[PDB]
Design a protein around this ligand. Structure first.
Ligand SMILES: COc1ccc2c(c1)O[C@@H](O)C(=O)N2O
Ligand SMILES: COc1ccc2c(c1)O[C@@H](O)C(=O)N2O
Ligand SMILES: COc1ccc2c(c1)O[C@@H](O)C(=O)N2O
Ligand SMILES: COc1ccc2c(c1)O[C@@H](O)C(=O)N2O
Lengths: 491, 491, 491, 491
């Protein structure tokens, strides 16, 4: 209640199910764990600003001022990774901590911080996978020209990326330019629940002075142009040894047709195109999915010939952030339907319940994460069969334990998260068995952190952060399983 | 609410989906529609007695004294079949109306009645499929020796069958000896909710003086012996022209493993063996499923060598009464589990909800009918691959509209029943496409009737019986669809 | 005569058919090769006692007093492994040589012996896979409380295992707690042809004072409890580095339905459950196969809740000892069949000839080994699809050349054994190609040895032991093939 | 002993397994059943001559002088067909009875005989399928020019066929020009065990004055030319109504590779080409199989351009006479192998035992009929996939009960033949289920008859001929099964 059946013991993945080269790790992002939001010269980001100006927009009225205080306690994060036997740590670099004014003078204190983290990871035999931007825009640029809604963001991002390549490229060999562009554009400029919090007039978000049918696409277009410029520069001047890789991390939901009919089959394809294709197809072929152009038209910016060429094949590795799936239900084009939110442009509504009336899968805690591992395997095979089978890493995967869930009284006894993770790791094995080029699995939530609009009410970590006991790191049941899974020598 | 998605129009079956020889029809049973329970010399049956002595055991305190009064209004039943274009009518002969005392003097009035019905059907180009026994035991035999719990029932049934063969065999060429032996044994001697209403002491049924772990098997064993004797006689003296067929109708539920594990796969097989195999395997190979003998042992009677030989291959046609499916959940053998009800002997609990927490399918009205057409196709393929692919007729299939269902205010607007039927007819097509030898589909409920322990609160008919307007027959939406489906010429 | 067709040359396996990590080796057991049965303080085992008290029970009236004298000539065994290029040597530790009295004082001479063997193997780049118990029970414990028929065997075995872990665990990282529990229980307590030689009164074995329907299950139950205790201790205190593995080696025969019918399909599953499932299912899920509990009932001991939990997932690696296959023929439950031997409980007779009258495969020398490589591939896929695809090693595989076989005049020209081995190695390749997690192949018979009740009349070795020439080790044709297969540099 | 397992009862074919148009029947041939060898002007055939001149060449020293005396007792043959419910009777017309001198004056008594048989069959609702030639050559032509070894046989056969078309074509609408040309050429001119009994000098046959490497091919070539001429004439002048069909009946054995290797796969194809392709490929494409031409060369006559065109597509229906299968073992071309018998030209020896030492199937009575129904299904699929899926009739299928077989003491209790037939009828169903265009099944042996070189020692009939009781026809167990199978009304 809710009924949650666990895998039978012989169905639990073993490390040897994957080859020696496969990589298991965990992920975090700068604003979600660092804290020290105004320390040592760091400038404010769009999220610092959003939380400080519209605090009510965060469920529990919290923010990332301190978070898990990883700016000061990173050694404990490294320790947690080591204790679990993880071989990779995916983290992000705070743009505003490196370049307080977005552009200009680099903050040496910021550079020193990441060098410490990187060196500690390497000293502990953990490989760093770095996300350059994680919704982390310097408020200075937001104020100056509207951040990602202005073309200037392209060159400014490029210069930021270069600072990262020059200072950390000698040790960091795997990069992700952007994290979840679809999630970002949808929630930051469509619904407006995320910083900068914009939406169309009449809608309910912090700043209803935007356009939910246009700003999301404008921001996404600049993200892609920024990505293209950064990768071009990287391949030209920062991969001289030929052993570095750069890609992007996409948020992706699996989709099943709502009802067995060719109409929902078509709707399903539109959903995938909109959720995943929006940003994946451009980095693969140099243009947006045909479905999007045919439905969004003039509201979706056109790429020039050279831009399309720069974008095509601009990803060495593809990161997939997978949590759940939905049923795709066809919506007809008629005068009875008029798009108002960008998501309406797919003409396919995402449903949590199918035609037979059943939820797609068991709820896992937070309202939007329904467990459906099959969805991940399906997406991985699409990457294989449709997009050339490029190197794919599951850069995020996991569930949240929520405040107030009576079925989760002990924050360390996360058997549900463990079962979910084991099932998805098994789903990855299935994809690999079927030929998909999957190279790793990074659990989202090395540690509990700031879950954006839901604050700290949602705990996604393998490792508990005891907020009332000095933000102490405490291994949960899931974390202990990884220690065993990875054969970490015991004391 | 409950969400009930209908088939897309191009997915609706057409008559031409099936060959010219395929047969569409409808079914009823004597006690459920006839009425005239004590008219023209008819003796009381176990159901007359059960209802009259323990009226409270019927949900709405009703009985079959009058029912749809088909004893007098059969011409209207024939008319309904004709109006729908049905080619077959499956009905049963009331033992107590033919032989008031179970044995002895035949009631000519009873014989005249069925001859009228049979001749009317033939005059209207409808083929009669006759069920000899439909839970219809003469109370005279119940009182004399305990009915089906005594070996004497074997020869008495045989003589009854012979009366039917001699009087109707010249026109009736398709017979079913017994209807749903599993349902009958389980509910009449296990739970005791059906006549004679017996169960183990301490249990809640009309007469808790039986044994829920033994009487069900004793009754079933006599049913099989009776069947064997009747068929032997039939093939020896009543099929001289070689164009008659005799079989049995089995109640069957589809089963899916509760959780994906070899344990529930094994449980599923035990469920099928218990629900279907109990009576099907004996008529096929001459003995009960191995699983049942291994778990029931001494409580399951042994067949002699000649009895096994008589039973083996004793069915020309197999009738499958299908309504719903269940998940099968493995139960371990241990001192913590002790069978008390016969159904416990399968060591597999039937669940309406699966491991992922989802119901097997949408509820259709009455509490036990969850829609799952896939289950039928699966059972039909088991008949094909495991039991020799004998001729199979879907002798019953349908749903109930229940009193008090706010989502079913107009008894004639049965679009739900129609959708359900179209989906199952399509499921049969799938089985046929896959090689299953399915010869027909008979909707259960030519007309609304007495639904045993639920009285008239459950309406299963394609044709409405207006109880407050002289039991008038009124075609429901589903019935009208069949008129179109069968291309009945319009007035 | 008997016609023995060999593989075509292009069908012979090459080492490169398997990956670099795959392991090829050979196996032996303590009583079968060591000799020195009473040397340096060694106490007598159940086999020393059995042979010395009932010598007539061994075909050629021989015993393991000297065997291949590996206690003194182990360096020659290591040399043979090196000459063949084997990477693994699976051998067993003699309980009675380590603990002469079963419990108590450890025999340092015994410890020194195995340390010498282990160190020599490591010096020669051969990895030791150690079987802790190989039917090798100290007679002291047999006399004291009946050995494996008494619960005390559980803790005593545990202490023995601990002595092994403490003394050899620093170099030995792969263990097997028990060897062929099914074979052992069946022949030692069922038919009684193996030590201690017990069977039911009236039967023909050395000591017909037991119970062939109960002692086999009692012994097996204690073996499983002993295994569970030993593994719990091992994982808790002897795998601190996390690089050690412990499992069990099961004797397994492949099975094909005698006749194509669902009955023999069911019989086949019962045969697999009885031959393999008896001990495999408990170490996988913590309980015996449902089929066995349903047929053996009170004669098969129940596991407590904590015991089931200790047993579940108590195997890191699964060893499969495969030699041949049989047809499984269904046996009905009836008063005409009454179990007297434990093997009767499966209600499936093992037949060497099928329904069409053909033997399952060509005889290879000894009466029970019919060649059927397909059977191995089938079992390996069952491990994959049904039991979670755990790490599997073929811990035994091979054939015997028998005394008196006119078609085998030169003991070194074992082309038959070679062909058999090549075919089974190819069968393993097939399983691996189909996804089975097979990690190695160990030929049973590094050297000819004491074949229990058949004495030295059966030669299973890749390497000949010239009994009349000082037990000299001489490479047979098969051994020479391995030298080539493994690319051993030539002199 | 020999172990002969029967089908399980639910695996026995039912008539309804096949569609209404499928045809079940039985077959015979003129010399094998007629008798009256010199009655009413009939001239002697090559078989009359062979038996009368070399009586020792028949196992039991018998001949066809009287046989089953069907010339006088044909009404009893028709009765047997009727009693079994057969819809088709395949019989042959005796050339020497119609044209005593091979050419010239037609024997009206002969014409009257067949008209009586044909009319009786039609009066009894049985369709006649007529074989024009069944090894039945008039000795007059043998003496005049060597029968089938001379080109003159072509026009003479043509004129004979025309007599048949003109006299019987108004009622007979299905014809077979020749029966088993491969069997005939091999045994009559290769081994010489059949009339005229020729073989190479030095060999053991009645007249070792031929050439086993050439006469078989010369005879076969003339058979094909004769066939082509007869069909051309038939289609041009005797199928004006367009409802008649003419084809050929081929003896065919199934083949499996002796050992799993590409060499035996190639050998298998050569075996099929030689056994079946020899005569089938010419009537399909107008030339012999490439394999035969490449290996036989100058010894295999070349077809002219017009002859190839006449032969191509010269069969409306294909008759397959199937009894058994063999393993095909590759034979290399080398100076160590020199063909001496025509069968040697396939460079593939037919083996009854496979590489694993097992017979292909259970012996059924006579030495050459090993039961292997799979072989038939395989051949039927080759007809479908390779030769265009033409209409195929199983024109012969069955087994012999042999004199002296202690396991067959009662000639009427032919349960073995029944099981064999049920299995092959089931094999046909399999082929049909897989798309093969199979139109009927004719059991060889309507009645026991003269089995050529084995005389009456081999009984192939569904109906027993009591030779000591006036050649009385007595239905065997198999025949009675067909009565039930075909639903023949009982008396
Ligand atoms: C529907 O609400 C969300 C859907 C997806 C996300 C979300 C919130 O916030 C984080 O958990 C995240 O990384 N993604 O991708
Ligand atoms: C679970 O309750 C029932 C299950 C099956 C049945 C039932 C009641 O009564 C009739 O509807 C019937 O024909 N069957 O088969
Ligand atoms: C049927 O006789 C035997 C069956 C199996 C075995 C046996 C004897 O003794 C050894 O060869 C052995 O290791 N096994 O597994
Ligand atoms: C190997 O001996 C024979 C092989 C085939 C045949 C044969 C004898 O004689 C008849 O039975 C026959 O019709 N054929 O086809």
């Amino acid at each position: 209640g809710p009924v949650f059946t666990k895998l039978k013991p012989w169905q639990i993945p073993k490390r040897d199910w994957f080859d020696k080269d496969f990589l298991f790790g965990a992920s975090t992002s700068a604003y979600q764990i660092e804290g020290a939001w105004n320390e040592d010269g760091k400038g404010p980001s769009t999220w610092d600003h959003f939380c400080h100006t519209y605090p009510e927009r965060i469920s529990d009225m919290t923010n990332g001022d301190v978070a898990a205080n990883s700016y000061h306690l990173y050694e404990e994060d490294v320790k947690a990774l080591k204790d679990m036997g993880m071989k990779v740590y995916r983290f992000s670099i705070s743009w505003s901590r490196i370049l307080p004014d977005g552009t200009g003078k680099v903050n040496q204190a910021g550079i020193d911080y990441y060098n410490k983290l990187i060196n500690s990871l390497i000293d502990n035999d953990i490989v760093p996978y770095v996300t350059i931007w994680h919704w982390d825009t310097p408020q200075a640029l937001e104020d100056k020209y509207g951040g990602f809604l202005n073309r200037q963001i392209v060159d400014d991002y490029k210069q930021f990326a270069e600072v990262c390549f020059k200072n950390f490229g000698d040790r960091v060999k795997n990069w992700f330019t952007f994290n979840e562009p679809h999630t970002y554009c949808c929630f930051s400029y469509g619904e407006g629940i995320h910083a900068p919090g914009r939406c169309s007039p009449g809608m309910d978000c912090a700043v209803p002075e935007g356009d939910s049918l246009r700003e999301p696409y404008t921001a996404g277009h600049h993200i892609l142009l920024a990505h293209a410029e950064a990768v071009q520069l990287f391949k030209a001047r920062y991969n001289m040894h030929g052993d570095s890789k750069i890609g992007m991390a996409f948020d992706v939901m699996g989709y099943e047709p709502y009802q067995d009919s060719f109409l929902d089959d078509q709707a399903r394809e539109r959903s995938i195109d909109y959720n995943m294709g929006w940003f994946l197809e451009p980095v693969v072929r140099g243009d947006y999915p045909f479905s999007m152009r045919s439905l969004i038209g003039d509201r979706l910016p056109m790429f020039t010939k050279e831009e399309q060429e720069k974008l095509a094949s601009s990803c060495d590795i593809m990161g997939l952030n997978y949590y759940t799936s939905r049923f795709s239900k066809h919506v007809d084009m008629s005068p009875d339907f008029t798009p108002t939110l960008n998501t309406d442009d797919a003409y396919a509504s995402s449903e949590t319940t199918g035609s037979d009336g059943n939820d797609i899968g068991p709820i896992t805690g937070t309202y939007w994460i329904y467990m459906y591992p099959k969805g991940l395997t399906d997406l991985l095979l699409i990457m294989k069969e449709k997009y050339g089978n490029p190197p794919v890493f599951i850069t995020e995967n996991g569930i949240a334990d929520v405040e107030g869930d009576e079925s989760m009284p002990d924050p360390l006894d996360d058997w549900k998260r463990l079962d979910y993770l084991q099932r998805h790791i098994s789903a990855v094995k299935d994809a690999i068995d079927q030929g998909a080029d999957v190279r790793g699995h990074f659990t989202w939530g090395l540690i509990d952190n700031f879950e954006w609009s839901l604050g700290y009410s949602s705990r996604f970590g393998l490792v508990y952060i005891d907020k009332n006991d000095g933000n102490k790191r405490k291994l949960k049941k899931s974390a202990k399983w990884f220690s065993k899974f990875n054969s970490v020598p015991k004391p």
